[PDB]
Structure formats: C-alpha cells, structure tokens
C-alpha cells in the first residue's frame, strides 16, 4: 500500500520492467501495424463488502491441490496429531481374505489374514479409512534398534487417541501387519500416500480430513488465519539420513523417500517404516538399499519396497531435532522445513 | 423452372417441371505463426531496462 | 475458498460462529405431541445366529 | 467481439441468481442451527 | 422422443411468474424437457 | 404448406429472500457479529449467583 | 361472504400480425409476443442487470 | 429455481439448483349438428314459391 521500499517493492506485489513492458505494449502507440514513415455496524458491514470489493479490483505464489476425504476415526486420529503430519490412505479391506489365498507361496497359512483382520474390526468397534503416520510407528516399534524413542511413540498413543484401548488395536494392527508379510499380501501394496495435514473437521465416529496432495507445505490456507503456517514433523525412529552416513557433505536439493523393510521367516517377521532423506536419483537408490538392508536380504525374494515422497528445494536442506509434546509425552521428532510434495509409485526388488 | 416443348401423339404429354436444390456451406481456415524470442519479451516487458 | 474442478470453479463460503447458552437451569422444553406412521412393521421375524 | 454482448448478460445474471441463492443459504442457515441447538438443551416435559 | 431444450433467450423475458414453489423433480412426468443444473452450466451459454 | 411451432410464453420464479431477523425465532438468539473471530481463541463468559 | 362477484369480460387474442408472422413463414417458428421479446433483447444488451 | 439452506459439515456442501422444463399443448375440438329439412331447402332457395 505505497510504502517507501520503492526499489524492489513493485517486484514483490506481483515490478519495474513490467511498467516498461507495458510501456511499449500499452502506453505507445497507434501500432498494431501502422503506416509508413449505525455507528459500528455500517460501516462495519460496508467495510466488509469493501474487503470483498478489493479482491475484485485485482485478479509469486505456487499452486496447490487440496483434497478432502471424510474418514472414520478408528485407526487414525487427526485430533491428537497436529497439523503437519504424513497421512497414509488404504485400500478396501474385504479383498484381503481372498488375495491371501492365491499370492501365498505353498506351505503358508492363507487363513491368517482373514482372522487377524477379523479381530481388528472386532477391536476397533470396542470402508477405505485412513491411518496416520504416527499411529503406524508404534506398531512397527518392536523392530527398531535404539528402541527408547520407539516406546515413546507408543506412550502417547494409548493415552491420547480417540478410541478405547488403541494399544489393543496396536497389538492387533501390528498383528495385522505381521499377517500381511506372512500371507504374501505385502503392506506396501495397500498403503497409499495422502497429503500432509492442513486441517480436519471431526464429528461423531468420523472426521473430514483436508490435505495437500501436491504442492508446498508452509503457505497453505490452514483455515485459521491467525496461524497460517504448518511444518512437517517426523519421529526420530523412522528418520534416516544418507548424507552423513556416507560423508556426503556436498550441498544440493534433497529428496524424500518412504522405505519399507520386509523380513520373511517362519513366525519371526518384523515390520519397519522408514522415511529416507537423500540427494540420490531414484535410479541410484536400490544400491543403497543393498548396502544398509542387505542384512535382511540374506535372511530372505523382495526385501525392500520404496516410494517417492517429495523434494526439499533448498541448496542446503535444513533439519531440526526437537521433542514436541503429544499431549503429555515428549517424543524426539525430526523437523523438516520447506517440503514440496510430489508423490510417486512403488517398487519391488525380488 | 424448366421449359417444355409441345409434341403430337401418341407420345404421352409432358408437363411443366420445376427444380429445387439447396447446398451446404463448407468451412475452412488459415494459419500463420508469429513467434517471438525471450530477450524480446524482457525488453518489451520493461524488465531489462 | 477457490478450488477448481471439472473445468468449473468452486467457491465455498464459510461463516465461523460461536454459541453460548447463557441460561442457567433448563431454558427450553420439547414435548411430543402426536404420532405418525410407526416405521417398523411390528412383525414376527426370528433371529438367526 | 456482435452476439457475444448478448451472451455476457446471459452469463452475468447466472451470477446474480447464484449470488443470491447462496447468501440466502446463510439466513435460512442460521434458523436451522438454532433448532438443532435448542433441541439439545431441551429435555422433554414428562421428564 | 423429441425433447427440445427450452429457449433461454425467450425465457430471459418471462411473460408471468410462477407462484408456488416445490421440489419439481419429485414429479417429472408432467413435463417433457426437464433439466437440473448445479449453480451454473456450460451449455446455457 | 405452412407449419410452425410456438412458445406461448415463459414463466420464471422469484426466490423468496428471508432475513432471519424477520422470523419469530429471532427472539431466542442474541446475535452480535464479530468482524474478527477466527483469530480468537476460547472466549469465556462469566456468571455470578 | 358475498353474493355478486366482479368478473372480467373479454378473452385474450394472439394474432400473428407483424414480424412474428414472417418468422412463421420464413423461419418456420413463432414466439408469443415477439414484438417485445425482440425488443428487450436490445435494451438489455446495453443497459444493466 | 430452488432456494438453499447452508449446513455444517461433514455434510458435503450443496449448491444452487435450477429446474428447467417445458410443457406441450394438447389439442381438442367440439361438435354440434344443425340439420335442416328437405322442403326447407326449397323454400329458402325459393324453388317452391
């Protein structure tokens, strides 16, 4: 509104050459081709319409695609988990007891997934829903090494998620996950990336979750114009760098990847969810999965299954390590800053 | 409107005739390309001034 | 909120609000007057387990 | 462009209808909630 | 069936108003050309 | 031959526009508008007895 | 409540006299009063909404 | 046209709806019979005068 930063101030309002571009176009000339040679309210409602009319006088910023999806709140809880977490959508659940009968190698129990999932519908009642990211960490917490913060994820879930004995669902949904790998219907073939949390509107039994299926994170209309900001938070058991572990100190844009690990043994099967940050091409990633996760390759013939997640566009990608309070429990959480979401597909490595 | 000519028998008589056609307009276009260059955008825009 | 779909353009409008019920004690009553069609036929349908 | 001038009118009204029919949904929208509110403050007479 | 859509230019200048208002689609079969639109549509123009 | 179809004239509606403040029910409400609310966090009200 | 009622006398009349005739012959259609619809599709094209 | 009433979620939002329809006339007649008598033809013509 006519400040005194008058050098580049015109450039941020969209510039100085734009009036010069409009000088040869609009200011001059006769070309295209020429010839030869009622005290408070009203005006409060009046300045309300004036707050509408100024938006009609005129019409940089990137583009979004917001997605809404009304989802029951058994497994995931957008209430407990703050704005800026990952969300993972699921398929339809009744295809699970039939596809386990066919894709199973001979000598395995096909009727395990039909009963393990059947005891979660009987545990979540104590339909393509949603599972948030922080709920999924504590289910696979029994296969992470430091294990101090894998139990910190499990601490705030049983006490804060909407639902009676979500920890009973945790030992059932992880039993559902351990029934996935055994019955050969793999969990990467079910989980679908949904956007990061910007807002959610709940009700009885269900919630209207809004997210960002494509775009940046930090400038979304959150819904509350008091706080139009939202940063991405990931717990420290799933966050795996690859720049420090290989002395790769060179700057550049960084990529984000989801990574699953499988472990196929006779009634000793583990699950793990990792979120890998790297500067590597997606064609030059499976060699790194050979390097760290060749340990489960010897015991296993798919052993890993990954998917793209998004891009940190900074020449120096920026990380933070704080302990946010999920209710009354502090969990070590890696903070990612300025993430531009671009989804992708999955991959098998048999 | 076509004409006749009268004739003697025993040839059965011919009557005045008429003709009606319509036709359907057929449609075409033409094309030519004007393309500019980047620096020419900068100068006209006023950015490189 | 402007979010385009189907070639169209959507404008969703919202008016945030708040409600407090400033009565102490019961300020409203709801009495049931008549009865329309009882929905469920009162039948004999046994149950199967 | 000569027709098109006739066409805007045919489009511009189609805002007027929509602009009215929408804002209306709020006035009628309020009176809705008061009911859905007052039905939950209110116990029945017999009780 | 020959259900020609109604003529918007003429209906732009109506002869007289309707009075009662009802959900119309409830009973269709009285009419011939019947159309629903959500807030606006492309063919109107 | 001469044939034609015809319109014998067209009829619109008028959406009845309703101010809430017209209805009797406006007695129940006490309606005071924030021009700025969504900024606000929990508001409180106080009673004494 | 009353005995003698007041009643209109005449019918209405729709005659094709005028430009509404030509369209019946040439165009093959008719509009009830085209001497008005035809008019107000001119002023509207100018003034307002 | 049809009015709206706004609602809270999680009801998917509803948009104004416009109903268009046309009706078609149906055609009828009436009948009456005038008949004369034979001799009455003669007299009027004048043949029997």
Which among A240, A196, A193 has a CA at the least distance from the CA of A216? A196
Q: CA-to-CA distance for H22 and G21, rounded, in angstroms?
A: 23
Q: 3-class DSSP state for residue A110? A: helix
- Apex A81 CA angle, A86 and A152, nearest 5: 95
Place of tokens 């800053």: A337
The sheet carrying A192-194 orders its strands as: A130-132, A87-89, A192-194
Residue H20: beta bridge partners? E35
Q: Long-range contact list for A52-60, CB < 8 A, 24+ apart?
A: A60/A14
Distance from CA of F12 to the nearest CA of G (A): 15
Q: CA-to-CA distance for A136 and A159, rounded, in angstroms?
A: 16
Q: CA-to-CA distance for B47 and B41, rounded, in angstroms?
A: 9
> CB–CB of E17 and F10 under 8 A?
no
Residues from chain H that touch A201, judged by Cβ atoms under 8 A, are 9-10
**CA max distance for chain D:** 72
User: Where do runs of H (alpha helix) occur along G1-49?
Assistant: 19-22, 34-43
Residue A225 has what DSSP assignment?
A: T
Can you say how many angstroms the Cα of residue E44 is from the centroid of all Cα atoms in its chain?
11
> CB–CB of D44 and C15 under 8 A?
no
Q: 3-class DSSP state for residue B1? A: coil
> CB–CB of F18 and D20 under 8 A?
no
List, in sequence order, every beta strand (DSSP E) within chain A.
65-72, 87-89, 130-132, 192-194, 196-202, 206-216, 232-235, 239-241, 254-261, 272-278, 304-312, 319-326, 329-336, 340-341
Q: CA-to-CA distance for B18 and C46, rounded, in angstroms?
A: 85
Instruction: Report the b/e string of B17-48 with b at 16+ CB within 10 A.
Output: eeeeeeeeeeeeeeeeeeeeeeeeeebbbbbe
Q: Is there a contact between A72 and A210 (Cβ–Cβ < 8 Å)?
A: no
Kindly list the residues of chain H whose beta carbon comes within 8 Å of any beta carbon in chain E. 2-3, 15-24
Residue E30: beta bridge partners? none
Residues from chain D that touch G44, judged by Cβ atoms under 8 A, are 6, 9
Any D CB within 8 A of F33 CB:
no
Q: CA-to-CA distance for A230 and A227, rounded, in angstroms?
A: 8
Handedness of CA A23, A26, A32, A37 (dihedral sign): negative
Tokens for B37? 């260059």
Residue A339: beta bridge partners? none
Residue F1's Cβ-count burial label (10 Å; 0-12, 13-18, 19+) is: exposed
Best to test chain H binding among D25, D32, D36 (most H CBs inside 10 Å): D25
User: CB-CB: which of H1, H5, H18 is closest to D29?
Assistant: H5
Give the other-Cβ count within 10 Å of A86's Cβ: 25
């Amino acid at each position: 509104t006519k400040p005194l930063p008058t050098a580049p101030m015109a450039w941020a309002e969209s510039s100085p050459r734009e009036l010069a571009g409009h000088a040869p176009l609009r200011r001059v000339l006769r070309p295209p081709i020429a010839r030869r040679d009622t005290r408070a309210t009203r005006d409060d409602t009046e300045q309300a319409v004036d707050k509408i009319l100024r938006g009609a006088r005129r019409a940089g910023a990137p583009r979004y695609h917001l997605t809404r999806q009304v989802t029951l709140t058994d497994l995931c809880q957008p209430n407990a988990e703050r704005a800026g977490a990952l969300l993972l959508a699921l398929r339809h659940p009744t295809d699970l007891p039939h596809l386990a009968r066919h894709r199973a190698p001979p000598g395995r129990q096909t009727e395990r997934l039909a009963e393990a999932w059947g005891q979660l519908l009987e545990a979540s009642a104590l339909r393509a829903g949603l599972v948030s990211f922080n709920f999924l960490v504590a289910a696979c917490a029994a296969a992470y090494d430091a294990r101090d913060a894998a139990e910190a994820v499990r601490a705030h879930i049983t006490t804060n998620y909407g639902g009676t004995r979500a920890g009973a669902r945790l030992d059932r949904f992880s039993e559902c996950l351990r029934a996935m790998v055994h019955t050969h219907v793999f969990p990467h073939e079910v989980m679908r990336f949904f956007g990061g949390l910007v807002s959610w509107v709940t009700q009885d039994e269900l919630a209207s979750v809004t997210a960002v299926c494509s775009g940046p994170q930090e400038a979304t209309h959150t819904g509350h114009p008091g706080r139009p900001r939202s940063a991405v938070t990931i717990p420290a058991c799933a966050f795996v760098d690859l720049d420090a572990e290989l002395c790769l100190g060179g700057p550049g844009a960084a990529f984000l990847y989801l990574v699953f690990t499988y472990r196929q043994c006779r009634d000793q099967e583990l699950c793990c969810v990792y979120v890998v940050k790297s500067q590597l091409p997606p064609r030059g990633l499976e060699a790194a999965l050979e390097r760290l996760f060749g340990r489960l390759r010897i015991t296993n013939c798919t052993y890993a299954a990954f998917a793209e997640l998004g891009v940190m566009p900074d020449d120096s990608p920026r990380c933070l390590h704080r302990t946010e309070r999920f209710g009354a429990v502090g969990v070590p959480v890696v903070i990612l800053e300025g993430v531009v979401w671009r989804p992708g597909g999955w991959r098998a490595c048999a | 409107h076509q004409p006749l000519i009268a004739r003697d028998g025993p040839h059965p008589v011919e009557q005045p005739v008429h003709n009606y056609m319509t036709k359907v307009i057929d449609r075409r276009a033409l094309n030519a390309a004007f393309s500019l260059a980047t620096e020419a955008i900068a100068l006209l825009t006023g950015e490189a001034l | 909120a402007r979010h385009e779909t189907g070639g169209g353009v959507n404008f969703t409008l919202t008016q945030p609000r708040g409600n407090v019920d400033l009565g102490v004690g019961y300020t409203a009553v709801a009495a049931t007057a008549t009865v329309r069609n009882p929905v469920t036929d009162m039948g004999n349908l046994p149950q199967n387990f | 462009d000569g027709i098109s001038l006739h066409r805007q009118l045919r489009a511009i009204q189609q805002l007027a209808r929509n602009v009215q029919a929408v804002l209306g949904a709020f006035e009628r929208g309020t009176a809705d909630q008061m009911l859905h509110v007052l039905l939950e403050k209110a116990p029945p007479l017999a009780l | 069936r020959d259900p020609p859509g109604y003529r918007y230019a003429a209906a732009m200048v109506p002869t007289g108003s309707i009075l009662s208002t009802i959900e119309v689609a409830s009973h269709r079969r009285l009419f011939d050309f019947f159309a629903r639109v959500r807030s606006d549509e492309n063919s109107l123009y | 031959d001469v044939e034609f179809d015809a319109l014998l004239g067209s009829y619109c509606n008028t959406l009845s526009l309703v101010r809430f403040l017209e209805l009797g029910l406006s007695v129940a409400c006490v309606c005071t508008k924030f021009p700025e609310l969504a900024y606000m966090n929990e508001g409180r009200v106080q009673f004494e007895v | 409540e009353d005995t003698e009622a007041d009643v209109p006398v005449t019918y209405g009349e729709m005659v094709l006299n005028g430009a509404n005739l030509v369209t019946a012959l040439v165009m093959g259609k008719a509009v009830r009063s085209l001497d008005d619809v035809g008019r107000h599709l001119l002023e509207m094209q100018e003034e307002q909404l």
